């Protein structure tokens, strides 16, 4: 049922088609896979007058387009390139519908782009509509991306209710595949007063988080980016357990990040731990090198070791060259030994 113009455009009739040529058909083009891309591209360099001509047509259909697989990109491009009065008009259409839009597969994209594009007060007015619905949004396939963008974009005073809603839920959310990403954003962007209670709760569950499919991601984040004191708390949960945890599908990630990112003394302590440990009739290092997960830990220990600790590891690794060649991943440590021994 396409218009002749949209059919002609799709058949490459018009290599010099312009926004002005679309009058009457703008909503139809916006809902088309190819027509939408055309409008998206043209909006970048359109004159304000050309943008207004398009906007006049789409405004009546704005909510429909926000929730359309292809039309949402056109609304995003008005947040990106539109005038302040166009963004005003769109924020108006969004008002009172931020929650359903945030939960909508395409509308969540529009709210995200709006947050990147609008004033601090406009942002505050949008995000408050999520009050009472924070955990629902955080776990939602679409809403979680809106909550993440709020944390990246919005003033901390206007975010506080999100932080408050996490109290008592940090463990549940950190072990959730979408929740764990929101927790990471909080750790990056929120103020120290906001992250303090989140971290305190995280440290109450470290043992379980390090072994969790998604929780280990949060623990890794604190190792890579957090304050020394928080890293030390995590190290306290790894010491005495390096051999066991290095062989764990998920906790091995955490062990590696301890070796790479913890303090100089902490890194040395964990390395020392496996250098002096025998795993029955085999070395702890022997056990670790044949393991699909722990081998990478050993790789990092070699990389991070001080010249003195490195001497010892390389010395204990050497008699197991033939064992290394059996494994697809033995490649890396072998190459390290070769480089190390001239």
Swiss-Prot record:
Residues 144-148 are annotated as: Non-specific-nucleotide binding in RNA target. Disulfide bonds: none annotated. Signal peptide: none annotated. Pumilio repeats lie at residues 21-56, 57-92, 93-128, 129-164, 165-200, 201-236, 237-272, 273-315. It is found in: Cytoplasm; Cytoplasmic granule; Cytoplasm, Perinuclear region. Residues 36-40, 108-112, 180-184 are annotated as: Adenine-nucleotide binding in RNA target. Widely expressed. Expressed in embryonic stem cells, heart, kidney, lung, skin, intestine, spleen and thymus. Expressed at intermediate level in brain and liver. Weakly or not expressed in muscles and stomach. Expressed at various stages of myeloid and lymphoid cell development. In the testis expressed in the spermatogoni, spermatocytes, spermatids and Sertoli cells. Residues 72-76, 216-220, 295-299 are annotated as: Uracil-nucleotide binding in RNA target. Residues 1-341 form the PUM-HD domain. Residues 252-256 are annotated as: Guanine-nucleotide binding in RNA target. It comes from the Eukaryota. Sequence-specific RNA-binding protein that acts as a post-transcriptional repressor by binding the 3'-UTR of mRNA targets. Binds to an RNA consensus sequence, the Pumilio Response Element (PRE), 5'-UGUANAUA-3', that is related to the Nanos Response Element (NRE). Mediates post-transcriptional repression of transcripts via different mechanisms: acts via direct recruitment of the CCR4-POP2-NOT deadenylase leading to translational inhibition and mRNA degradation. Also mediates deadenylation-independent repression by promoting accessibility of miRNAs. Homodimer; homodimerizes in vitro. Interacts with DAZ1, DAZL and NANOS1 via its pumilio repeats. Interacts with NANOS3. Interacts with SNAPIN. Recruits the CCR4-POP2-NOT deadenylase leading to translational inhibition and mRNA degradation. Interacts with DDX20. In case of viral infection, interacts with DHX58. The pumilio repeats mediate the association with RNA by packing together to form a right-handed superhelix that approximates a half donut. RNA-binding occurs on the concave side of the surface. PUM2 is composed of 8 pumilio repeats of 36 residues; each repeat binds a single nucleotide in its RNA target. Residues at positions 12 and 16 of the pumilio repeat bind each RNA base via hydrogen bonding or van der Waals contacts with the Watson-Crick edge, while the amino acid at position 13 makes a stacking interaction. This is Pumilio homolog 2. It comes from Mus musculus (Mouse). The chain holds residues 706 to 1049 of 1066 of the full protein.
